[PDB]
Write a protein that binds this ligand. Structure first.
Ligand SMILES: COC1(CS(=O)(=O)N2Cc3ccc(Cl)cc3[C@H](C(=O)Nc3cncc4ccccc34)C2)CC1
Ligand SMILES: COC1(CS(=O)(=O)N2Cc3ccc(Cl)cc3[C@H](C(=O)Nc3cncc4ccccc34)C2)CC1
Ligand SMILES: [Cl-]
Lengths: 305, 297
């Protein structure tokens, strides 16, 4: 019993965190085999950030301009290249602590763990979701750039995010490990703002199924809904449209609890209309959207209370 | 910017998790140097049950390697299995006993394999609101101070309300519990007042000031009000501990108490604080300072 926002154990990622310094800028890098991956803005000044020409800034650098530190050991950079918004620093030593890993690009609604780092040293781990507007609501201070997001289903680390910047609203933007930004963001000090955010509907439904598994059914009703009538109502509360894929994905949780997806959609519609009336669901007074159907099946028991 | 429920990095603890099997029971153990620590219920008159066991009855598995048990002893509700191999991954560590209100990270494990990490607090009723399934017994709670792991909790059981109970690493239970199948229940819980105040200071630091007002209060008037909402009494020590956050934000502790008093009497009125519609009590003053400063390990 219980339902917590649970992160993956971070040990496999901790052994990959290094510090990268170029001139006055210091940030974090991910050391996998003989390559250190880091945000390309490590080559920038604060002035450069308005309209940086990364190709022009990079051609002026040599390998020995990049200082890489793994613990108390200085790594020697023997090559460098840029792939999209990430810099790949070839080093003389392969990381003996390199785990089994993949680089995966995720979709909005997907969750992952963030190992927040400063000066190549891990400070904390927390669970996050890629918002529908492609930002993340993280907890990051200056010096956190290069911190990574990941999942560890089985013993393989799937790296899905590298931190690049904080937007004016306090939310965060970054790239996959191939350097492609999530969303329409640029690694430039440009007037850019997160688009209007929405609630991840499939995740709220998954969390309502988690509540039923743990023994709570106060929020259910005798009604059902068509998928179209549910979406017409959901859009009015800034909820993401629910697709047939989302309905298919919720199939296993529907079969375990005995509550059809469209019947759980009817309960959500009523919760949006009435609120909670002094009650909570899994210790929360708001509808939680940062647990996916996969996270619920992973954390919850296979036997409904 | 941002404020999340953050756990310590778990790597130093992951390298200590092992699987312990005795008969039909399988649970987790903590391997430090040449000793594996686990709940004694893996084997009730525990001394009588233990005398009938030999070293070879305890099967200990670290990853894909079988460790050989060469001795065993009981300390309170914890079994200490002496093994033939010292853990080469043993970190710098201490065994510490925490107080209610203090927080810690839990590395939840099944079959000696870590599955997740989450942050939680020792409730004033000595239970923890964890997330554990069958097979999680022996999972540990800890804090990291510089490079030293301070082990503070070992999981033993789930109570009927779904909350959890366990011991320190010396085998002493947190709370009036016993390690047997009998009628036991968590007492009525209260809210950790000093932690709610710390979280209100975290909200101010993150730019949320709607709850701030011109009023102040006395410690006595605040405590009279707090007792009526099932909040723990606020002591002069709690006021002293909140000193740094008070100086940083410019809001006196009894000034923040007047805001909390108004939040208890009026509610949030459709508003949230740090993305929450409830008053959060699982961040200590030190957790707030640490997350709003970037301390590393
Ligand atoms: C909205 O302005 C802020 C960021 S900044 O200092 O202006 N900054 C400009 C900028 C622009 C583009 C890119 Cl790719 C990186 C950056 C940098 C940046 O985003 N750094 C930070 C990342 N993650 C959390 C940070 C919390 C605080 C400070 C800085 C952080 C540096 C919050 C102050
Ligand atoms: C009231 O909870 C139940 C627990 S039990 O299976 O009866 N149980 C009896 C018992 C007695 C003493 C001691 Cl020290 C440990 C235990 C065990 C226990 O507590 N295990 C569990 C711990 N943490 C989460 C668990 C979630 C599910 C199951 C079991 C868990 C085994 C479901 C009925
Ligand atoms: Cl995805």
């Amino acid at each position: 019993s219980g339902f917590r926002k649970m992160a993956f154990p971070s040990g496999k990622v901790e052994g990959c965190m290094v510090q990268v310094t170029c001139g006055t800028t210091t940030l974090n890098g991910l050391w996998l085999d003989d390559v250190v991956y880091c945000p390309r803005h490590v080559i920038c000044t604060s002035e450069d950030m308005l309209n940086p020409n990364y190709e022009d800034l990079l051609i002026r650098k040599s390998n020995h301009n990049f200082l890489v530190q793994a613990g108390n050991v200085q790594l020697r950079v023997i090559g460098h290249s840029m792939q999209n918004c990430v810099l790949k620093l070839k080093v003389d030593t392969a990381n003996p602590k390199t785990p089994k890993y993949k680089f995966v690009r995720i979709q909005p609604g997907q969750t992952f763990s963030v190992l927040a780092c400063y000066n190549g040293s891990p400070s904390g781990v927390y669970q996050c979701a890629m918002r529908p507007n492609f930002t993340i609501k993280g907890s990051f201070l200056n010096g956190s750039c290069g911190s990574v997001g990941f999942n560890i289903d089985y013993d393989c680390v799937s790296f899905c995010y590298m931190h690049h910047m904080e937007l004016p609203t306090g939310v965060h933007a970054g790239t996959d490990l191939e350097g492609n930004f999530y969303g329409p963001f640029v690694d430039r000090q440009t007037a850019q703002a997160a688009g209007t955010d929405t609630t991840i509907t499939v995740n709220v439904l998954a969390w309502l199924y988690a509540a039923v598994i743990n023994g709570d059914r106060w929020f259910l009703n005798r009604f059902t809904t068509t998928l179209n009538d549910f979406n017409l109502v959901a859009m009015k509360y800034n909820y993401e449209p629910l697709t047939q894929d989302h309905v298919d994905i919720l199939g296993p949780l529907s079969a375990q609890t005995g509550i059809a997806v469209l019947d759980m959609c009817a309960s959500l519609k009523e919760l949006l209309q009435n609120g909670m009336n002094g009650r909570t669901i899994l210790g929360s007074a708001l509808l939680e959207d940062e647990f996916t159907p996969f996270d619920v099946v992973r954390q919850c028991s296979g036997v409904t209370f």
